[PDB]
Structure formats: structure tokens, C-alpha cells
Design a protein around this ligand. Sequence first.
Ligand code: NA
Lengths: 126, 118
Amino acid sequence: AETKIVVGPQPFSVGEEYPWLAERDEDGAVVTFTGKVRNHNLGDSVNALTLEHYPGMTEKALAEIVDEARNRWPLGRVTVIHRIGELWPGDEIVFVGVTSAHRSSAFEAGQFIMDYLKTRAPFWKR
Amino acid sequence: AETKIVVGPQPFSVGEEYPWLAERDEDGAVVTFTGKVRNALTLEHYPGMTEKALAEIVDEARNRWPLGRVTVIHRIGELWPGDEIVFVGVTSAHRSSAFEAGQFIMDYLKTRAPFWKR
Ligand code: NA
């Protein structure tokens, strides 16, 4: 069961990520989450969200969240992508994909990974 | 917000369905589920009534959670291992809303919807 972890400034495309994620026949249940910049992430009028990461450490922390999810649920392929840089309301900034034999596992793991990425993975906002 | 409901034998592509599901800025959280076939399973449905039933299950979801766009697609006909047979796409501005609604639609679609094996 492969894991893909990428962090960078470029737009990602779910259509380009999904086929790898869902490739394996034994991965019968496929869950994705895409998170975009909200208008509440700003709240005032529109200036940009600027996100920075810590090269190496951010990806490590993401890797460790996925490992932890794999200790709790029987997961197949997992992808975690996080965009950084200057971002605006409506931009796709995070993608988590998880597979499993059971849908419950995929749903619960997908949520676990997002929850922990939001509270543990080191990013700096401004 | 709009609801897309499709039932038919044709393959779907998540990459083709996703941009519509995810178009609106207010729809800042996008959850999808895809179920695959785990010889030739033939899946049948109740023409008319199952589409109506999918529409009803989504409407009930909208009563419980603040959703934006939603897509439910289910395949019928001949199907083989590894074929993607069901796609449920739910959006919200809020993660727990979209995850709970996605799960609610799937549960009711695996225990109550009128699809069956021939
Ligand atoms: Na967008």
C-alpha cells in the first residue's frame, strides 16, 4: 500500500490524482476530501492567505499522520497533497485520498488525517 | 444548490465529475466516495422509482446538513471486478457536514435503495 505526499506552490488537479489513488482492485472503497480557502479563512474583505511550510519537516509530519492512520485502519493507497504560497478564496489547497476494503474505514481515516493535519502539521499562515 | 442524479450502464469518471461538484467558492469542502465491485455481476434497478429515491435521500441530507452541490451516480448492467459502480459527491463549507452527509447517503443507498443483483 503506497503513500504519496507532496507539498508545493503549484495548483494540483483532483482529476490527475484520482486515477492513481483508485487504481488497485483490492482498494474497493475510495474517499477523497478537497479543502479550499474559505471566505471565513479571511472574514474581512479579500486579501490573500499566504501559507509557508517547513521543507522536510512538514512532509515528515504528514508522513507520520498517515502512518498513525495505518495503525488504526486497514488502508490501501493514500495521497496527501498540500498547496502553499499566496492563495485566495476558492483555491484548492489540500487533498486527502484514502482507500480501503470497507467504506467506514476510508471515511473515518480520511477525517482523522484531515483533523490531525490541521492541528499537527507545521505550517505558518499570514 | 443543485443536485445531479444519474443512473445508467455507462462508465463514469471521477475526474470529469469533480470540477462541477467543486465549482462554487462557498462549497469549500468537497467529499467524495467511490464504491467498486469487491464472474459478471448484473445490477438492476426500478426505472424511475430509484432516481426518485436517490433524490429523496439527498433532500433528507439537505434537511440535516448545510450542503452545496451534490452528485450521486450509480451504474447498472454488467459489471466486473474493479469497476467503479457508485459515486457520491457532497460539498459544504464545513468538513463534518460533508463527511456525515456523504456517509448518510451511502448507508441509505446500500441498505434501502432499489438496486439488486439479477
Ligand atoms: Na475553486
